[model samples]
Target: KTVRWCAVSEHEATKCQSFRDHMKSVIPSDGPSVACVKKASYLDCIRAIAANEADAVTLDAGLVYDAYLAPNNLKPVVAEFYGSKEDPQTFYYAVAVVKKDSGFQMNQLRGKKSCHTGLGRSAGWNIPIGLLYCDLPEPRKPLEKAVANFFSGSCAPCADGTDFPQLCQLCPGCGCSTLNQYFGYSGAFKCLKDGAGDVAFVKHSTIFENLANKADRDQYELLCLDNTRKPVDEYKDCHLAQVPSHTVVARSMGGKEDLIWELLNQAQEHFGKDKSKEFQLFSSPHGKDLLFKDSAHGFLKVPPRMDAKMYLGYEYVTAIRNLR
Candidate 1:
C-alpha cells in the first residue's frame, strides 16, 4: 500500500512534491510508499482523507476540529512547531487589529467593515465571533447572518457567497468565489492597509511581517474587550485567547497511520530547515510556507494517546465546536 497525500488545492500540489520525493526515498521497499493528489479546496482534501481517497493532509486547528467529528472522524497525527527549536511554542495568540483612532472598541463592531484571514480559521473567524456573540442579540439567527447584519461588509475568504452572501458582501474573492485576493494573515491585513476594511482579524505576527517599519505598525492598536487598547507584542496579557497550532490529520479507519507518522518523521530529519541541505520541510518556492506557515521549522508528533479534543484542549476545542 502507498500513503496518498492530498494537496490543499490544485496550485498547492507542486508544493508537496519535495516531501513526497524525500518520503519515497526513505520508505522500505516493502513498506507503505508516498504519492500526491490534487484537491479542489482544503476542505475537500480533508473529506478525501476521511473517505480513504487520500491518507494525509495538514489543516488549521479550526478545520482539524471539524474533521475529527462525525461523518469524518479523522485523527491528527502530527502538529506544527513554531518558534526556535530551543523554545518551541505549541500555540499562538489571535488578536483583533484596528486603527487606534477608529473610535471603535471591541464591543462596537456593529456597522463596521471587517476583514478576516478566511472563513473557518481560528484567528479570522471562530475566535472573534466566539468573543463577540456572548452579549449580542438574536440567538436564533444563524451566526453568519447575525455577523452580516452587525458588520457592514467584509473581505472574508472561503465563504459561500451565494448561500452566505452577506458574509461575503465585503469579500474580494474573484467574483466572490474562493479565488480570494485578501484571505490569509497577510492578506487580511492588506485589506485594512488598502482601506477596504476597518479592522482585520488575524494572528499577531501579521503586523510584524507585513509592515516594514515601526511607524507602519504603530498605526494600529490591539482592540480589547475592556474598552481599552494595547500594543501588538503585549498580546500575551492584553488580547484574545491563545489558539492551538495546525496539524496533519489521517483517517481513523484506514489511514495508514503509522506510515504517515513515519513519513513525516523521516522527511523532517532529511529536509528540515536545520539540516545541511537547502531543501527543507516547511517552505514552497511558489509562496511563503507553501504547505505550512513559513515560520515553522519542524514537526512535533502528537502523542499517540491523544486525539484532537485531548490535543487541542477543552477551551480551543469548545471554541471551534461553538462555531458549527
Candidate 2:
C-alpha cells in the first residue's frame, strides 16, 4: 500500500541517504510507498511534481507563491507547525534584526549593509522588499538594482551577478555561488554578527537558535515598520507582520493530496516526538532539515476552506507578486 512519494533532495549524499532511510521506516509498510527524488533545489522539485514525476515537496511560503503562479497548478496540502504541541501556531514573524548599538530605525535602512536569507525567500526577500518597494525608482528598473542602490551593499544570495553586479557587491564572493558564506538565515545573521552587514532580514526564531546567549540576544533588536524598535523577544506583537508558515505543496491536477496526507500523518505518528523515543521526526543534527523544518513540532492540516491566496493572505500574496 505504500506509494512512492517524492520529496526534494540535496547535493549532500549522506544526509539524503540518511533521510531516505528514516522515511523508509517512518511509515508502516502497509500504509504507502514513499520514495526520494533527488532535486538540487525547490525549483527542480516543482518541475518534478508538475510533470507527474514526483508527488510533493515542502516549500517556503514565498516559493509556494511561485508554484501557485506557475502553469503547473500547485496547491498547499499541509502547513508546517513550528509552535509546540498544545498550541501549534501556523505562523511565524518576519523581522529585521540589527545590532542594539546600531542606533538605526526602519526609515534609516537606506544605504546600510544588509544581509538576506536568500532572494525570493519570505522573511528575507518578499517581506522586506515589499515594505520598501515604494521607495524605489522606475518601473523598468530591476528590483535588485533598486535594492543595490538602496543599501550601501548587501549579501542577498541567489542574485544573477551577470545581470545585477551591484546587487552581489557585498556577497562573500563576486559570482553567483550557492555556497556563498552569507546565504541562509544563519548565514545572513552570521554576516551581521561578523560586521559584514548592518542589518539582517530573517525569521523570529533565528536569534535564539543561532546566537544562543542571553547577552548576545540582548544586543540585538527587531525593526518595526512604525520606525520604532523592540527586543527580539517581543516579535509576536512588536515586529513585522506574521507570515504564512511553510507549506507542503502538490499539483492541483491529479494530485495525491489525501494519500500524501495519510503518509505524512503516519510518518509523524511513528517518528515524531510524541511516539518515538529516539529518532524524533523534526530533529536534524546536521544543521539542516532536508524535507521539513528542523524545529517543527507537527504538520497541521491546512483548512480545506482556504486556497493558496487565502492562506498567504491578501497582503503577502500581493507583496510576492510585486516581487516579480
Candidate 3:
C-alpha cells in the first residue's frame, strides 16, 4: 500500500521524493511505500487529505484547529517532541520577547511596534492575540482592526494589508507566505534584532535556536503577565500559553493512522536527526522546518481520545474562538 504525503512547496515536494527513494531501499518490498502529492498550500493539502485525494501531512496546532472543524474532519495521528530527548514533550510555550532594557511590562505593550510569526500561526497570532483581544475598548471592532489600533505598527504577515495597512507597514515583504522576510519565528525574531520592531511574539525556543553566540541571548528577555520581565530561560514561568505541538494529520474516518505511524517510526529510526546520512526526517535543505519541525526529536503516537480539540485544550480553543 502507498501512503501519499501532501507537500506544500516544490522544495518540500523534492525532499519527500528523496525520502521516498531512500525508504524504498530501507523497508521490506511489501512494506508500506511513501509517495508525495504537491499542493499549493497547507490549506490545500488539508482539503486534499479530507477529500481522500491525499493521505497525510504535518500541520501546526493552529492549522490543526481548522482541519478538525466541519467538512475537513482531520485528526492528528503523530505528534512532534521538542526540547529534551530525556523528557520529551508534545507541547511548547508562546512568549513575548523584548530587549532586556525595554523596561516594558505585558500591560505596557500598547502603542509599541511588534513582530509576529504570521497572522494566524499558533504562537505568533492565536495565543498572543487571544491573550490580548479582550483589552479592546468599546465599539469593539474586528479583532484585526483592534490589533492594528493597539500597536503603533507591526509586521503581522497574512493580515489584510488593504484594510489594516499598519499591520504590514514594517514588513519588508508584506506577504502571507515566507516571501516576507519577517514571516516565521526566526524572521520575527530578526525583525526585533534589526530594530524593525520593539517586541517579538514567538515560541520559547526561537531565541535559543537563532542566537549562535549563546551570550547574545542575554540581550533579550520575556514579558510576564504580572507586569515584570524574566530571562529567556524562565519561559516556563512566563509565557502567553501552553499550546499543542505540531502534528501529522489524516482523515479522522477510515484514516490510515497505523500505516502512517509505521512508516514514520521506521523513517525516524533510520533518518531522524543525526541518525542517517541518507535522508533527514526533521531537517531539510530547502529551508528550516520544511516537512516537520527541525528541532523535533521523534514522533509520539497521540492517545486515541486526543482529538484536535482535546489536543488543543479547552481554554486555548476558547481563547482562539473568542478572537473571532
Candidate 4:
C-alpha cells in the first residue's frame, strides 16, 4: 500500500517528495511507499483526504475540531510529542502575554492593539475568545465582531480582511498564509516585541522559544484570568487554556492505520531528530513546521479509543463550541 501525504506549500511538497524517495530505498519491497499530493491550503488538504484524493496531513488542535465536523470526518492517528523523551508532554498552554511595563490589567483591554497566532487556532482564537466573549454586551455578538470592536486594531492572521477590517488593520499585508510576518506564535510574540501590538495571544513556551536572554525574557509577563500578572514561568496559573499538541489526521474509515503507523515508525527511526543527516522528519530548511512541528521530538500512536473530541478534551471542545 502507498500512503499518500498531503502538503500545503511548495516547500512542504518538496519535503514530502524527498521523504517519498528516501523511504523507497529505506523500507523493504513489501513495505508501504510514500506518495506526495500538493494542495494550496490545509483546508483543501482536509477536503482532499475526505474525498480520498489524499491520505493524511498534520493539523493544529483547533483545526482538528474543525475537521472532525460532519463533512470532513477525520480522526487523528498520530500525536506529536514536545518537551523531552524523558518527560514527554502531549499538551501545551494558551497564554496572554504583554510587556511588563504596559501595566494594563487583563480586565481593561478595550481599545488596545492585540496580536494573535491565527484566526481559528487554539491559543490565538478559540480559548481566548471563549473567555473574552462574556465581556461583550448581552445578546452576544459574533466572535469576530465582538473581538473587532473590543480591540482598536489587531493582527489575527488568516481572518477575513474584507469582512473584519479592524482585525487585520495591524497586519502588514502579507496575505492570510504563514507568509504573514505576524502569523504564528513566534510572529505574534514579535508583534508584541516590535510594538505592533500591546498584547499577544500565544502558547506558554512561545516567549521562551523567542527570547533566550533572561533579562529579555523577563521583560514580558502573562495576564491571568483573575486580572493579575505573573512572570512567564508561572504559566500554570496565568494561562488562558491548556490545549493538545498538533496531530496527524486521516479519514475516519479506511484510514489505513497499519501502513500509516508503520511508515511513521520507520521514518522516526531513520530520520527523527538527530538520527540522520540525509533528512530530518521534524526539521525544515526552508521554514518552520513544513510537514511537522519544528520542535516536536517524535510521533506517538493515538489510542484507538480516543476520538478528536476526546483527545482535545471536554473543556477545549466546550470552549470552541461556546465561540460559535
Candidate 5:
C-alpha cells in the first residue's frame, strides 16, 4: 500500500522522510509505499485533506485547531506519534511589529490600522487577534472599530452580527467583503517597509533573523501579551509574544491507522535517538494521550483538565472557496 504525506516544506519533508524510512525498516513486510513527502502550507494541507487531495498532513497543532473551528468536518486519527520526547507546547512564536519610528504602544494601536497576511493565517491573524483581545480591557469594541474602519470607510456591523468588516480589497484571492475589509497585504516584507499600517504582525523568529542582518535591530520592539515566564530574554528589545504549539493531522477519510501509528512509533524512536536532520518530533505525554483514538478526537478535550487546558481551543478553519 502507498501512503502520501505532506509537511511544511523541503526542509520539513526530511523529518517526515526519516520517520518513513525508519518505519519501512521496522515494518519491512508491510511494503508500504512511502510516497515522496510534498511541501505545502499548513492551511493547504488541511484543505487537501478536506478535499481528499492527500491522505495525511503534518502541521502545527494550533493551525489544525483553527481549521477545526471553521466547521470543516475533518477528524484526526492517531494524533500522537508515540515516544517523541518534546514539549507539546514548543511551537512557534508571534509578535506585533511596528515601524522603527512608529511610536505606537500596544494599547495605543487599539484603533490604529493593523496589517496581516490573512485572517486564514494563524500566525498572521488569529494569534495576534487573540492577543489583542486578551490584552485590551474592552477588546471587543476597539477591535471591532479598528477592523471596521479598516475595510470600510466607517465601522459597520458584519453581516454575521460582528461589528468588524468582513472583507477588504487589499486581500489576495477571495474578496468576500467580510473581515477582509480591514486586512491588508503587500507582500510579506513590504507590508512593514512601505508603512502599510502602524503595526504589523509577524513571527518572532523572522524578526530575530532580520535583526541579525541589520545592526540597528533596536528599531522594533516585541509586545508581550501573556504573563507567563518569558522565553527569550536575550532579545529584550523585541517583544516575545505568546508561543502556540503545532500538531500532526491525519485526513478524516482514507486515514491509515496501522501506517500512521507505525510511522509515529518509528518517529519516536528516531527523534529519541536524534536521527533526523530536517525536523525533530517531540510531544507531551498528555499530547500523546489526547491524540490517541480513545481520547477526545485526538485533541485536548475542551474545558480540559488543568494540565490539558494549557493547549485548549484547537480548531479547524475551512478554505475560502475563492481564496485557494
Candidate 6:
C-alpha cells in the first residue's frame, strides 16, 4: 500500500516528506509505504484533491473552509497553523501600498488604479477588496452601496444628460470601473517597478518587513480607513480586515476514514514544538476540538444555517476555472 500527499511548495513539500519519513520510522516498515510527496501551490492542491489526484493536501485555513463547500468530495481534517496573538484577526488588515511620499489616502484613491495579485487570492484581492468597500467614505450606507454605485453608474456624461454610460458600460451591476481597473501581478512585490498601477493592496506584514530593511526604502506607505484617531502604526497593525485561515484537507474517499484521521493526527504531532518553527501547526481557537468533531463541513464557526454554497462565493469558482 502507498500513501501520497501534496503541499504548497518544494519547501513545504519537504516538511511533509520529513514528517512522513518520521512517521514511517515509528509506525512499522511493513505499514503503508509513504510513496511520494509532491510540491504544489495552494490552488493546485485544492484542484488535485477535487480531481482525486491526491489523497490529501496542506492548505491555508480559509481555502479549507471554502473547499468544504466544494463538491462534497473534499473535507478539512485539520487546521494546522497559528500566527501571533492577534492571529484570529490578522487577516483583516488591508494595507494599500503607494509611493511613500504620495500623500495619498484611502478616500483619494477612489477611482485610482490599484494592482492586486488575483481575485481569489485571499491576501491579494478578496480580503483587500472587501476591506476597501467596507472602509470607503460615508454617505455610502453599506459597503455594497458604494460598490454598486461605482460599478453600476456612469463616470462621464452620455450624449443625453444621463450620468455616464461608458463607466458602467463594462461592469453589469456596479457603476464604478475601479474594481475592474484593479490589476494583479504575478510578482506582487515587483508590481511597483512594473509600471502596472499607482498603488497595490498587500498584506500588512509584507509592508512592515520591507520597511524594516531600509527606512529610506520609501517606496510605499500604507493606506487604511480606521478613523478612531489612533496612531497610524497601531491601527494599521491591529485592524481586523478580511482574512481566511490556512488549513489541510482530506478528500472524501470510501473506507479511508482511519487513514485520514491517522494522517491528521500524525501531522499535528509533527507540527508540535519539537519541529522546525516554520513547520509548526496553526493553533486556531478550536484546533483540537475541530479535529475530533465532524458536525460541520467547514472548519470555521460560520452561522449554523449558512450553506457551503454561500460560503464558497462565485469568485472562487471563477478563479478555479481560470487556473492555468
Winner on lDDT between 3 and 6 is 3
Against the reference, the lDDT scores of all candidates come to 0.75, 0.75, 0.84, 0.85, 0.44, 0.43
TM-score for each prediction? 0.88, 0.88, 0.91, 0.91, 0.52, 0.53
As for candidate 3, its clashing pairs are none
- Name the TM-score of candidate 3: 0.91
Sort by lDDT, best first: what order?
A: 4, 3, 1, 2, 5, 6
What TM-score would you give candidate 2 relative to the actual structure?
0.88
Write model 6 residue lDDT over 16-60, tens digit each, in one string. Answer: 566566666656765544544463344565676667666666443
Error of 1 at 46 (Å): 1.5
RMSD list, candidates in order: 2.8, 2.8, 2.2, 2.2, 10.1, 11.3
Model 3: how far residue 264 lies from native, Å: 1.1
TM-score of 6: 0.53
Count of clashes, each model: 1, 4, 0, 0, 33, 25
RMSD of 1: 2.8
- Give candidate 2 misplaced runs (Cα > 4 Å): 1-16, 172-181, 274-277, 304-306, 322-324
Summarize candidate 2's per-residue lDDT along 19-45 as a digit string, tens digits: 457766654556555666665556777
Task: Please provide, for model 5 over 1-324, each residue's C-alpha lDDT reduced to its tens digit, 9 standing for 90 to 100.
Answer: 666776544444554565456666655665554554463345666676666666666433444555555545444443432212343324445566665555556655555655564454545555655545544443345454445443222211112233344323233332212223332222333345555455556555444433454445565555554422222223344453443344445554465645655555554545433454532453222212111111111222112112211342323232121112
Residue 319 local lDDT, model 2: 76
Instruction: State how far residue 272 of model 5 sits from its true place (Å).
Output: 11
TM-score of 1: 0.88
